[PDB]
Design a protein around this ligand. Structure first.
Ligand code: HEM
Length: 406
């Protein structure tokens, strides 16, 4: 057996959070090591680079030599479940320019600033509606299943034209796909969603439909500008991202804010602080911190280190968002700080399409919780919560909460 010291200079990656709003111990070590890159070992033994510093993360996310093609054999897989993505058709998150832009531009009209503004009444109505139901249904609740997940789910379904009557099916399928640990169950969940979306496309070809899927069917698909399979992949990407990211931000923001009651109280006293607090929570919680997988298609020199063609690179935006040369005392939550330039949404051509919808949802949600349930508190200690592993979007699958009755 192994009878020698076990220290490595390529630690296992990813690591799991033990506290919802702090770096895993291994990530703090990576943050502290000088230099933009560090070697890591992925689940299957293959070595990869992680980017651990803020400016280098921007530079490398902007470098066209780091491809987003998940079907490349050398793309960095962080769990066996990734092989489902490598073997499946790709939405534009997995495309490089110029193909990336031709698909992304088919969807941007739904996510413009003007459109996001017009969505405020629907978002406020959805948030307060689910709040009405939860506040009436019990002294305690699971904030995730009763509030954090249904709210962004209903909103993105309206944007897409996906009927919410099927929400039990596709919410469950979304969860299985994002949170699966093995390739078979990820593949089944993708096929479940794909078959559902394919039937919706045929329905819209018979009776033109609402929302973005309706528009893609009536226009780009009818002109042959997007393949049917690509339309499915695109709708699936938007559906899942629209569900899972905002829901995780909501639950983790509640946990984090209740552990910083002085800042939560200041926020309640001055709602002009809510947009800045949302930016700080995005920086601090960085829930998609592994969404920056890339593969080099050519050699890239980075500050004396060399990324060789064919190596995998993961831009770890949670670590980059704790760069003390950008955010003073980076491990402190400070809703009054400038969290500008954070990487929670990435950077460059793939920067999050939904970022301003997410910012709107989280502002409405925080204002609604402070308005309607100012007495909200966790029903279990933080040490009893179960955090998702570092191989998926960060969050908690259950969040027991209570408040003052009626
Ligand atoms: C709530 C917090 C959210 C976070 C932290 C987040 C995070 C991210 C990140 C880091 C990326 C970059 C991926 C990469 O570089 O490979 C990304 C891309 C993307 N996100 Fe978000 N996201 C959020 C919400 C949303 C929402 C609500 C939607 C709604 C559809 C969405 C849709 C997308 C899409 C379509 C892309 C791919 C963009 C492209 O490849 O051009 N996201 N997201």
């Amino acid at each position: 057996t192994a009878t020698t010291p076990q220290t490595t200079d390529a630690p296992a990656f990813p690591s799991n959070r033990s506290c919802p709003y702090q770096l895993p111990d291994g990530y703090a070590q990576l943050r502290d090591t000088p230099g933009p890159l560090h070697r890591v070992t992925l689940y299957d033994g293959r070595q990869a680079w992680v980017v651990t510093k803020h400016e280098a993360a921007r530079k490398l996310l902007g470098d066209p030599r780091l491809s987003s093609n998940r079907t490349d054999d050398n793309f960095p897989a962080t769990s066996p479940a990734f092989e489902a993505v490598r073997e499946s058709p790709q939405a534009f998150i997995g495309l490089d320019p110029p193909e990336h832009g031709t698909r992304r531009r088919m969807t941007i009209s739904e996510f413009t600033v003007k459109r996001i503004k017009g969505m405020r009444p629907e978002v406020e109505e959805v948030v307060h509606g689910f709040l009405d139901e939860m506040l009436a249904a019990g002294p305690t609740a699971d904030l995730v299943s009763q509030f954090a997940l249904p709210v962004p789910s209903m909103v993105i379904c309206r944007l897409l034209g996906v009927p919410y009557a099927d929400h039990e099916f596709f919410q469950d399928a979304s969860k299985r796909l994002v949170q699966s640990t093995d390739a078979q169950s990820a593949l089944t969940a993708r096929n479940d969603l794909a078959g559902y979306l394919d039937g919706l496309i045929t329905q819209f070809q018979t009776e033109p439909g609402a929302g973005l899927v309706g528009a893609l069917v009536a226009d780009q698909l009818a002109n042959g500008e997007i393949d049917r399979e690509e339309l499915i992949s695109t709708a699936m990407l938007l559906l899942i991202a629209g569900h899972e990211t905002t829901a995780s931000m909501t639950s983790l923001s509640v946990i984090t804010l209740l552990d910083h009651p002085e800042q939560y109280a200041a926020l309640r006293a001055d709602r002009s602080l809510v947009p800045g607090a949302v930016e700080e929570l995005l920086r601090y919680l960085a829930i998609a911190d592994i969404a920056g997988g890339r593969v080099a298609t050519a050699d890239i020199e980075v500050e004396g280190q060399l990324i060789r063609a064919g190596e995998g690179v993961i831009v770890v935006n949670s670590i980059a968002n704790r760069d003390g040369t950008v955010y003073e005392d980076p491990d402190a939550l400070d809703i009054h700080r400038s969290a500008r330039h954070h990487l929670a949404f990435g950077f460059g051509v793939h920067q999050c399409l939904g970022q301003n919808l997410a910012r709107l949802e989280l502002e409405v949600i925080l204002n609604a919780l402070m308005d309607r349930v100012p007495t909200l508190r966790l029903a279990v200690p933080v040490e009893q919560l179960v955090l998702r592993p570092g191989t998926t979007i960060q969050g908690v699958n259950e969040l027991p909460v209570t408040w003052h009755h009626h």
